[PDB]
Amino acid sequence: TLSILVAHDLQRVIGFENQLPWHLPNDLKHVKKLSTGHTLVMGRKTFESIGKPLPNRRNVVLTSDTSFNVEGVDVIHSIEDIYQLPGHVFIFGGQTLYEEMIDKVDDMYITVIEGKFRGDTFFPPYTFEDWEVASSVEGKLDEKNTIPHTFLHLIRK
Ligand SMILES: NC(=O)c1ccc[n+]([C@@H]2O[C@H](COP(=O)([O-])OP(=O)(O)OC[C@H]3O[C@@H](n4cnc5c(N)ncnc54)[C@H](OP(=O)(O)O)[C@@H]3O)[C@@H](O)[C@H]2O)c1
Ligand SMILES: COc1cc(Cc2cnc(N)nc2N)cc(OC)c1OC
């Protein structure tokens, strides 16, 4: 099982200046719940942004840099390496990885952030022509979590 795991806004912004544009504790809990006990594949910049590997799952960083050898992180050097990892693999970002993988994955877990953020990094356009909504769940709003948001599980048709 290969899946995309992404949050993006109404214009498919995912990133600004190597961080998430929004503060949304609930999306990160969503991420924790989905990926715990499984495998994340991410690009180097995304990892640097996050600093350390997420506890309680396999962290895999795709990078060209032969000197990368960080404790708790496995490194891969080619996309083709992804297909050799066992178990449930989530493509974790960023833009380059989504572009390379979106035609390849079984499904996508997308948080739609119902807002318009200033961004420098984007999720690629897709159609629901190609993707079936297996589920759509409204995020609940509170004072911790103030941006409307929807969790989609999409499966390739
Ligand atoms: N909203 C979300 O769900 C979400 C999730 C993740 C990240 N983000 C955001 O996305 C942005 C970062 O994305 P980004 O696209 O700029 O960078 P990125 O995907 O985090 O990392 C790009 C780097 O990954 C490595 N890489 C990618 N494809 C490769 C390949 N085929 N072979 C070898 N190495 C490869 C390269 O590392 P080297 O240059 O070291 O070789 C490349 O420079 C940030 O703003 C971040 O906050 C958002
Ligand atoms: C869990 O913390 C982070 C997670 C992510 C990636 C990410 C965040 N949300 C969703 N829905 N999918 C993703 N792939 C990206 C981050 O920074 C760029 C994080 O730290 C702030």
Per DSSP, helices labelled H in 36-151 are 44-50, 95-101
Question: Which atom of ligand 2 sits closest to the CA of residue 109?
Answer: 11
Contact indicator for 96, 46 with CB cutoff of 8 Å? no
* End-to-end C-alpha distance for the chain, whole angstroms: 16
- CATH 3.40.430.10 fits domain 1-157: yes
* Contact partners, residue 83, CB within 8 Å, separation at least 6: 2
DSSP state of 66: T
3-state secondary structure of 17: coil
DSSP H or E stretch at residue 112? strand 107-113
Per the document, the length of the chain is: 157
Pairing of strands 89-91, 2-9: parallel
Phi then psi for residue 34, to 5 deg, are: -70, -40
Give the technique used to solve this structure.
X-ray
Question: Which atom of ligand 1 sits closest to the CA of residue 19?
Answer: 47
Domain assignments of the chain as residue spans, ordered by start: 1-157
Q: What is the resolution of this structure in A?
A: 2.0
Contact indicator for 103, 4 with CB cutoff of 8 Å? no
Asked whether the bond before 94 is cis by omega within 30 degrees of 0, the reply is yes
